[PDB]
Design an enzyme around this catalytic site. Structure first.
Site, short mmCIF file in Angstrom:
data_model
loop_
_atom_site.label_atom_id
_atom_site.label_comp_id
_atom_site.label_asym_id
_atom_site.label_seq_id
_atom_site.Cartn_x
_atom_site.Cartn_y
_atom_site.Cartn_z
CB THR A 101 6.11 50.45 27.76
CB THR A 102 3.45 49.73 23.88
OG1 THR A 102 2.37 50.19 24.69
CG2 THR A 102 3.88 48.41 24.38
CB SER A 132 8.56 53.27 19.09
N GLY A 133 9.08 51.40 21.42
CA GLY A 133 9.14 51.06 22.82
C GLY A 133 9.56 49.62 23.01
#
Ligand SMILES: */C(=C\S(C)(=O)=O)[C@H](Cc1c[nH]c2ccccc12)NC(=O)[C@H](CC(C)C)NC(=O)[C@H](Cc1c[nH]c2ccccc12)NC(=O)CN1CCOCC1
Lengths: 220, 219, 191, 219, 212, 186, 191, 217, 219
Positions: G1-2, G126-127
């Site tokens: 994820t993030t 990103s993610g």
């Protein structure tokens, strides 16, 4: 490894042969029941299969490799044909190895000269001997090791194509014992064994061996 | 002792030094460098009355050609290698091979042979003569060393040619190719001669026109 | 493929169908015999595709004889069985299927059943790999009594066979039942 | 005993390694000096045949420098090794190689051949150097069979020990900004001086011939 | 390559005979085989010797001693252990001591024959346990592995080879065999595979336990 | 296959199901999903049995052999590196609990090879059914007896609640000093 | 994820939330997506957990080989480029290089699925949860911020990304790669 | 092997020269109308099957190659030469130009043990017959007229005595029969020779029928 | 002959091994490595335009591990690079840093394989190895060109060896960083220098500070 002699001979193989003649004596006999093979020894007789066993002379530590190889060959042949290997082919296999080493290689040749005997059904009971040279010949009787000719020539002067195992083994023992001593081998280290069809059932501590120890009561 | 895999107590390698004791049997060949042209003559030794003498000269590429003078087999192997390498070059880059890249490559091959024990040093030394733009003459000693040259002569009694080289500037009369070639035939003195520079690439004037040119040293 | 292995007080029993039919279960053969003897106290019953059966029992014939000669002791079942699991696992593809059953004294009886990848179940009692296995575990789970004489255990394993064979189309004719005791071996054909 | 690159002597010396020191002891000098404002490797090759060019110094990047002494072939090959090394490191690490790691790499390269019974050790000691304002000048000299060492300037080749009296005035040698050359030209009593200094923009460069004139005309 | 050893005119391999001489020239170790156990011992200042014993555990069962070159012992011991493991992966059970002795004997064989290598410099003792019984095999540099009720390997063992028999007289119990081992051996190390399969080295304190 | 293990006040306590299944019919009344990699470290794999017996064999011998080759007790994380590296080369989850120079560590290892240190873990079909009861009652530094009863509770729930999970349970308390196994927790 | 990262007045400030959702069911919550490839530089990672972790260990030991082969700590740009060339050779992960270097005191590389760009005067995000925050964070951006001030931007942007992205985790970890020495930061949670 | 002598000649290959002297003689003569190719056939033992052993061979349909020295090493080089100089024509019809077949055989002959043999390959490829002796040393050379075997030691002069380019291949046959009959002990018959020819037109390799050589003599 | 190659004597005793040990024993770079109570010191003499700032025997092969080396220098840089390779492979495989002896299995075995295998020459280098173990006890090992994982509470290497064992004994009767380092620097004085402890950070291995060299030397 080494090249041919200027006279026309091989040094290395002559050396290893020199080594195997110094080994303690092994002997072989054929009768109706099956091959019986003597010894001066620690088992110094090993089974290849059930139907085949070999009795070795020479630098036996290197023979250990030819026993292991031998067994790999026999089991491989059974692997390929669903039939346990005829003795003659097995001897061809080992001598194919030995010749592989004496010729090309740069490795020293095996120091081992050993007997091998066994019952392919197709050809009755078999007996053979091998040399570092890679020459093998069938036999009815043999006495490789020290006093090769001295222990052979007694049988050669006193032998016949058929005997009982019970009478034949003693005739192995006349050479085998009188050479070292009349009683010594069954006083000391010793290892006769045979294939009735399978294993070398006689054992030096076995009561059957007492008959061997009793050959003298017959002998004297 | 007795292998190139070890140095002498002097600190010398003998085997590679023996390569020149090979090359001295070979027939002399000589080269001249005009500012825009290079001319390379050889000397084709004749083993019999009925033999046709071998050609020292070759032609590795358009503007590159060579003149090996040592044992023939290594020489041909170096030619097949240098040719295969120039063609690999063009086949990769749609472009003519750099001459010096080539010299550096072939010389790398020499060293690869003269370092490894199992492979013998070459008994030959190339005298490359070419240009990708401006005329050049390289020599390869039977080792990794290679030198550029202005004028070079080598093989048998090349000694005459060597001492003679001092008598003329390599380009004391560069401007005319006939001056050049006459310097070439003087410097060396059927026998071969070849020309490369500017517009015409490598060329072997072994024609009967060359036979006419022969009298010009005495004409 | 249809194989069984009941255990007993002083015995183990192993059994099979004797049909090796081909595609669409046409009976190309009725004398096929999956059970084999790797040793007097060691048996294997193979099942699944028959090619892989002969190849597998063949390789066991090899490596077990090789070990027995290389090391004097007759091989213990735990060795043959764990090694067996080691054998199949090297490649799934080698057997498109095979379902080995291993049986024999070790004189505590030893009954184990491999999967074709070499997944293995070291059971204390019966186990039944085979195309008709569900009928097998079905009958034998309830029919089984802990310990019996070799003949009652014989009729028992025979009732699991007689039951299962009549529910499956691929089940064979006959029954190579094989009750055994350490000193004796009793094979029979049941119809 | 002396017959192997590998076998030790009864006294643990490696005579075969020891001979490379003789080779390099006879072969052409190749001083590399260091200024307190740069680095200047130089060569005095002592090899009509061309006289115009025969450079010994060469770089692995536009900043790092190499120089050698000994057999030409082996060292040219090691220069190829260093080019491929600097470029490998540039492919992996997106930066130019530190001089130090390259130096240790060539230490291992040269070292390897000593251990092999068939293989022949390289016969060429190698100076390798670099200078930046932040990357202070250092001159690693590599004697064959390993043991590269950092230096403030080492002379190598045939006569180096008689030059060391001059280089030992390294206070005066460090005194220079761009006139160390002019000192050297008398000091030594074909040649290849160079540059890695602030004026060099720290990038390696052949010294300019009209900059070479002040040195030669200085006396 | 080239087998550096080759045959004599007299038929012997001289090189392996040399290694035999080195083992004879190297340090002592004992093995004694009690009816219900096996004991192996050896005669082993800045050096913290506690890390260093000729004794080594090949399995929970098997333990060994070499006489010759310690690094040679290291590599043989390594291949050996890797074989006990290679076996225990190949099959479901612990290796028989005789089988491991055979594989070590083949590994020793090859270098004695195979090209380019110096033959191993050391003897071996290999006490162990198996379903057959408590075992003790000495391995020769030649590949001549051999059964022993007892043995010796290191320097001045000609006279010392003949003290070991007395435990078999009436001292087959381990606790009495201990004296046979140490008094025959008269630093030191002792590993014993007892009635339990696992073996374990006796500490110097337990070495003083028998010193009285 | 539920497999649940949880750290206590000084020792990991692993517990697992005992019933193999072919997918439809059960193919075993019992199995060993609590393999003993070493005296103070065990693995509890879930997935194909074949792959599990494989990599646990190869793991057990890599770890026992390496322990023979070095002084140190084979500290728990090395098993995790070996296993995860093996799975990374290529279907079998694992849950391994050992105790060492660090804490009683416990790890969970995904089929793709991913590793995580965990306070408490479950894998298999019962995982969900075990995450439900396990998480609800968990507390760090439980008395080991609390581990003894809890891990059996979450196992029994992850048994009864799946078609794919059932049979008798077994549990063990991997103390650093010693494993303390019991063949049938039930 | 993030995974996110913004450079404060001097150094980098990386962040991530742990969840490690597995098959749209959380499996190993409160893991550690951010990494210590070294003290000088830390490497956020997201994508498949397995491929990432293996790649993480691999770049780790290249970083240490480089670390001691030349006693100076490896420039983080080189860590980036080796991860570039490595993941180039299928394997799949996305990740973030932050750290301190005497050559360049603070940068923030960002490696895509295969090829790697930088953001010297920017931020890297990103993610799955990135996409919410690209726009939000690229508004609040100003280069002057000190850690006391940018800690807020990191914290909040994580909180929004986690609010409306299901994969995005609970507990979050951040590192304040200070220009100077030690840069440590502790796990924290909001919603 | 390749341990260069201080004298500078390669050792090995210079030791290997003598092997051709063991060779029984053969005389190849390129001529304006072909290549003639004679050799001793008196090499035969009385009881070997008569004339059942050829020195002269055929590498390709339009190549014929008498051999010096060891019969074995020659059989090998002919084997590989047949293979290669055939493989050259793998789809395109032209057979390898003689100079390049021979160039192959030599370029291999350069690089075990150096071959003990020398060859005398001939054929018509370019408008004109080719005659290439290959020395064991890998040196390759195009004679107009040449001989091999130890008898070539002094017999070679005889070529110098007579070789004019301008001859009918029949005239050339007389010539080579002259020079080779001279070195024989037996008065020449078809059992003393194994002559072959490649015509400037026919270009086909053809061993003569014994009736032919019996006819010319 | 037996001496020319790594083979047994007629007496059964290896030769070339002794010769490599003469290489180390005539290297003449003595180095004392003594363990300290809960710490450990490793010292060596650091032995023109040459840089003492470069020179050292001590070298780290991980953070926790440092190995002084003595012998043929190229072999030393090679055995160090091998050592670093070894720790990196162990860490990569297992996630634990090697215990010093675990690094000695690799050091001593790799150094061993040379001994049987006749080709590649026996190792010419030796030296201590120090590192905190998983057991909190600091670990100090050694190795010989003949394989040896050794083991010591104290050690010496180089031209001096067991000559200084009895000398070391006097410190051994008196054997914190003050207390232990003085034993080392004295042990150089007993029979500039460079000192190296693992106990700076108690696990991290670092050579002691240059400014703090003198204070022990003057105390
Ligand atoms: C967990 C089930 S699950 C759905 O939660 O993951 C168990 C784990 C298990 C079972 N047994 C052991 C032993 C030791 C460690 C772990 C163990 N695994 C299973 O239930 C498998 C289901 C797979 C698809 C997830 N079951 C099997 O693999 C079958 C086992 C088997 C078959 N015949 C037997 C006889 C005796 C003992 C066991 C068995 N076998 C297969 O699935 C066949 N496969 C096909 C493809 O892979 C290899 C063989």
């Amino acid at each position: 490894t080494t090249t041919f002699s200027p006279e026309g001979r091989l040094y290395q193989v002559e050396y290893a042969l020199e080594a195997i003649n110094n080994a303690s004596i092994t002997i072989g006999l054929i009768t109706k029941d099956g091959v019986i093979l003597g010894a001066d020894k620690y088992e110094k007789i090993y089974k290849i299969d059930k139907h085949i066993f070999c009795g070795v002379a020479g630098l036996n530590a290197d023979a250990n490799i030819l026993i292991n190889q031998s067994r790999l060959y026999a089991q491989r042949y059974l692997y390929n044909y669903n039939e346990v290997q005829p003795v003659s082919q097995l001897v061809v296999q080992i001598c194919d190895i030995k010749q592989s080493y004496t010729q090309y290689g740069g490795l020293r040749p095996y120091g081992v000269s050993f007997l091998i005997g066994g019952y392919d059904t197709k050809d009755g009971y078999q007996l053979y001997h091998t040399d570092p040279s890679g020459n093998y010949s069938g036999w009815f009787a043999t006495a490789i090791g020290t006093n090769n000719l001295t222990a052979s020539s007694v049988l050669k002067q006193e032998w016949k194509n058929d005997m009982t195992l019970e009478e034949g083994l003693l005739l192995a023992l006349k050479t085998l014992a009188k050479s070292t001593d009349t009683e010594i081998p069954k006083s000391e280290k010793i290892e006769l064994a045979y294939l009735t069809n399978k294993d070398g059932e006689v054992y030096q501590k076995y009561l059957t061996e007492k008959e061997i120890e009793e050959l003298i009561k017959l002998y004297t | 002792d007795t292998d190139n895999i070890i140095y002498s107590p002097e600190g010398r390698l003998y085997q590679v030094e023996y390569a020149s004791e090979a090359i001295k049997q070979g027939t002399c060949a000589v080269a001249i460098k005009s500012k825009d042209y290079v001319v390379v003559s050889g000397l084709k030794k004749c083993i019999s009355k009925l033999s046709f003498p071998q050609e020292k000269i070759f032609k590795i590429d358009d503007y590159i050609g060579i003149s090996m003078s040592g044992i023939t087999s290594d020489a041909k192997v170096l030619t097949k290698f240098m040719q295969n390498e120039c063609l690999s070059h063009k086949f990769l880059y749609n472009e003519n091979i750099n001459i010096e890249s080539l010299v550096r490559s072939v010389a790398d091959k020499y060293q690869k042979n003269t370092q490894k024990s199992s492979k013998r040093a070459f008994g030959v030394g190339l005298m490359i003569a070419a240009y990708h733009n401006e005329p050049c003459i390289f020599e390869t000693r039977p080792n990794g060393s290679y030198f550029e040259y202005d004028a070079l002569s080598f093989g048998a009694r090349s000694h005459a040619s060597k001492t003679y080289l001092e008598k003329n500037l390599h380009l004391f009369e560069e401007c005319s190719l006939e001056e050049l070639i006459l310097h070439c035939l003087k410097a060396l003195k059927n026998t071969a001669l070849a020309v490369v520079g500017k517009n015409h690439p490598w060329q072997e004037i072994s024609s009967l026109q060359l036979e006419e040119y022969l009298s010009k040293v005495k004409m | 493929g249809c194989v069984l292995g009941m255990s007993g007080s002083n015995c183990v029993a192993i059994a099979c169908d004797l049909r090796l039919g081909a595609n669409t279960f046409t009976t190309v053969s009725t004398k096929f015999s999956k059970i084999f003897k790797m040793n007097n106290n060691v048996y294997v019953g193979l099942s699944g595709l028959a090619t892989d059966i002969q190849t597998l029992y063949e390789i066991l014939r090899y490596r077990v004889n090789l070990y027995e000669v290389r090391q004097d002791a007759e091989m213990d079942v735990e060795c043959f069985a764990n090694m067996l699991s080691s054998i199949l696992y090297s490649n799934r593809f080698s057997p498109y299927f095979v379902n080995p059953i291993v049986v024999g004294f070790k004189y505590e009886p030893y009954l184990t059943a491999y999967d074709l990848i070499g997944a293995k179940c070291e059971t204390r009692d019966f186990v039944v790999n085979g195309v008709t296995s569900e009928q097998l575990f079905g009958m034998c789970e309830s029919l089984y009594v802990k310990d019996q004489d070799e003949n009652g255990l014989f009729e028992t394993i025979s009732q699991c066979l007689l039951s299962a064979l009549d529910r499956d189309c691929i089940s064979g004719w006959g029954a190579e039942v094989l009750v055994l005791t350490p000193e004796k071996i009793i094979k029979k054909k049941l119809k | 005993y002396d017959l192997s690159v590998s076998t030790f002597s009864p006294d643990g010396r490696l005579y075969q390694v020891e001979y490379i020191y003789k080779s390099i002891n006879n072969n052409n000098t190749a001083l590399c000096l260091e200024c307190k404002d740069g680095i200047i490797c130089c060569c005095i090759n002592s090899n009509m045949i061309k006289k115009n060019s025969y450079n010994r110094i060469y770089h692995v990047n536009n900043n790092i420098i190499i120089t050698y002494s000994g057999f030409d072939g082996d060292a040219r090959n090691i220069i190829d090794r260093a080019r491929s090394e600097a470029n490998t490191y540039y492919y992996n690490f997106h930066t130019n190689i530190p001089l130090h790691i390259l130096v240790n790499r060539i230490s291992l390269y040269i070292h390897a051949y000593t251990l092999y019974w068939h293989m022949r050790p390289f016969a060429a000691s190698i100076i390798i150097s670099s200078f930046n304002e932040k990357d202070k000048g250092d001159i690693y000299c590599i004697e064959p069979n390993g043991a590269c060492y950092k230096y403030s300037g080492i002379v190598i080749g045939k006569n180096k020990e008689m030059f060391k009296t001059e280089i030992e005035k390294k206070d005066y040698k460090d005194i220079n900004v761009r006139d160390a050359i002019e000192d050297i030209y008398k000091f030594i009593l074909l040649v290849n001086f160079s540059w890695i200094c602030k004026e060099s923009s720290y990038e390696f460069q052949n010294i300019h011939e009209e900059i070479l004139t002040p040195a030669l005309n200085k006396a | 390559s080239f087998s550096l050893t080759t045959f004599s005119p007299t038929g012997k391999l001289v090189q392996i005979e040399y290694a035999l001489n080195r083992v004879s020239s190297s340090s002592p170790a004992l093995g004694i085989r009690a009816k219900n156990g096996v004991i192996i011992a050896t005669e082993k200042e800045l050096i913290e010797e506690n890390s260093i014993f000729k004794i080594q555990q090949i399995s929970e069962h098997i333990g060994i001693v070499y006489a010759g070159m310690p690094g040679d012992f290291r590599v043989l011991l390594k291949r050996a252990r890797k074989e006990a493991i290679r076996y225990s992966l190949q099959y479901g059970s612990e290796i028989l001591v005789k089988e491991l002795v055979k594989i070590i004997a083949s590994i020793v064989q090859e270098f004695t024959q195979t090209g380019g290598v110096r033959p191993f410099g050391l003897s071996l003792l290999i006490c162990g346990v198996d379903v057959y019984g408590y075992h003790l095999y000495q391995i020769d540099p030649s590949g001549c592995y051999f059964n022993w009720m007892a043995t010796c390997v290191g320097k001045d063992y000609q006279n010392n080879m003949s003290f070991l028999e007395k435990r078999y007289n009436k001292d087959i119990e381990i606790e009495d065999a201990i004296h046979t081992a140490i008094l025959t051996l008269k630093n030191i190390e002792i590993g014993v595979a007892y009635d339990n399969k696992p073996f374990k080295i006796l500490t110097q304190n337990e070495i003083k336990d028998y010193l009285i | 296959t539920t497999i649940c293990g949880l750290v206590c006040q000084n020792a990991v306590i692993l517990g697992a199901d005992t019933r193999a299944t072919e997918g439809p019919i059960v193919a075993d009344k019992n199995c060993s999903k609590l393999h003993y990699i070493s005296k103070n470290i065990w693995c509890a794999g879930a997935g194909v049995a074949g792959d599990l017996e494989h990599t646990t064999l190869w793991l057990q011998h890599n770890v026992e052999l390496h322990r023979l080759n070095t002084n140190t007790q084979p500290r728990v994380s090395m098993c995790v590196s070996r296993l995860t590296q093996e799975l990374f080369k290529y279907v079998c989850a694992i849950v391994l609990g050992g105790v060492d120079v660090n804490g009683p560590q416990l790890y969970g290892i995904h089929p793709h090879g991913s590793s995580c240190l965990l306070p408490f873990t479950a894998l298999g079909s019962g995982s969900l059914n075990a995450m439900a009861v396990l998480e609800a009652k968990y507390r760090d530094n439980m008395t080991i007896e609390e581990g003894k009863n809890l891990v059996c509770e979450a196992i029994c729930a992850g048994i009864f609640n799946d078609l794919g999970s059932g049979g008798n349970v077994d549990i063990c308390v991997i103390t650093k000093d010693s494993y303390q196994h019991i063949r049938p927790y039930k | 994820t993030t995974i996110i990262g913004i450079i404060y007045d001097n150094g980098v400030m990386l962040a991530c939330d742990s969840r490690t959702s597995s098959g749209t069911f959380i499996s190993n919550k409160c893991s550690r997506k951010i990494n210590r490839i070294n003290e000088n530089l830390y490497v956020c990672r997201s994508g498949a957990s397995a491929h990432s972790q293996k790649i993480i260990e691999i770049i780790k030991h290249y970083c240490v080989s480089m670390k001691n082969e030349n006693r100076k700590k490896g420039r983080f740009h080189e860590g980036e480029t080796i991860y570039d060339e490595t993941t180039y050779d299928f394997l799949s992960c996305a990740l973030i290089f932050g750290g301190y270097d005497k050559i360049k005191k603070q940068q923030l590389y960002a490696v895509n699925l295969n090829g790697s760009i930088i953001e010297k005067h920017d931020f890297a995000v990103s993610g799955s949860g990135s996409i919410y925050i690209q726009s939000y964070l690229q508004d609040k951006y100003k280069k002057f911020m000190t850690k006391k001030e940018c800690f807020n931007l990191i914290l909040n942007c994580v909180k929004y990304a986690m609010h409306n992205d299901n994969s995005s985790g609970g507990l979050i970890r951040i590192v304040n790669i200070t220009k100077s020495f030690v840069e440590e930061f502790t796990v924290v949670n909001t919603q | 092997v390749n341990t260069f002598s201080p004298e500078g000649r390669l050792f090995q290959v210079e030791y290997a020269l003598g092997a051709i002297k063991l060779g029984s003689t053969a005389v190849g003569i390129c001529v304006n109308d072909g290549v003639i190719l004679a050799s001793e056939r008196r090499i035969s033992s009385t009881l070997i099957e008569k004339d059942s052993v050829e020195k002269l061979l055929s590498i390709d349909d339009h190549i014929g190659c008498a051999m010096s020295g060891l019969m074995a090493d020659a059989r090998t080089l002919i084997d590989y030469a047949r293979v290669e100089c055939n493989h050259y024509k793998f789809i395109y019809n032209e057979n390898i130009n003689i100079k390049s077949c021979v160039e192959l055989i030599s370029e291999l002959a350069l690089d075990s043990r150096p071959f003990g043999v020398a060859l005398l390959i001939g054929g018509v490829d370019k408008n004109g017959p080719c005659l290439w002796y290959t020395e064991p040393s890998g040196t390759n050379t195009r004679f107009s007229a040449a001989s091999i075997g130890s008898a070539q030691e002094g017999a070679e002069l005889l070529l110098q005595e007579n070789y004019k380019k301008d001859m009918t291949f029949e005239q050339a046959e007389i010539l080579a029969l002259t020079v080779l009959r001279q070195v024989m002990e037996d008065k020449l018959s078809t059992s003393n020779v194994e002559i072959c020819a490649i015509k400037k037109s026919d270009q086909t390799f053809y061993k003569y029928n014994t009736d032919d050589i019996s006819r010319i003599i | 002959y037996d001496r020319h190659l790594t083979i047994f004597s007629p007496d059964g005793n290896l030769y070339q091994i002794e010769y490599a040990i003469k290489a180390v024993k005539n290297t003449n770079i003595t180095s004392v490595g003594v363990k300290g109570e809960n710490c450990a010191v490793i010292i060596s003499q650091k032995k023109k335009l040459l840089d003492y700032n470069n020179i050292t025997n001590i070298y780290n092969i991980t953070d926790e591990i440092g190995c002084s080396m003595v012998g043929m220098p190229g072999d030393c840089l090679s055995m160090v690079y091998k050592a670093r390779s070894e720790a990196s492979e162990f860490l990569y495989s297992n996630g634990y840093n090697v215990n010093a002896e675990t690094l000695c299995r690799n050091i001593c075995d790799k150094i061993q394989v040379y001994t049987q295998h006749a080709y590649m020459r026996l190792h010419a280098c030796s030296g201590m190895i120090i590192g905190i173990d998983e057991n909190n006890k600091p670990e100090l090992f050694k190795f010989d060109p003949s394989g040896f994982c050794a083991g010591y509470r104290a050690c010496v290497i180089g031209n001096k060896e067991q000559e200084s064992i009895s000398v070391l004994e006097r410190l051994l009767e008196k054997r914190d960083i003050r207390n232990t380092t003085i034993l080392a620097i004295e042990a150089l004085q007993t029979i500039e220098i460079e000192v190296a402890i693992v106990s700076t950070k108690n696990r991290n291995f670092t050579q002691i500070s240059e400014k703090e060299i003198d204070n022990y030397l003057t105390y």
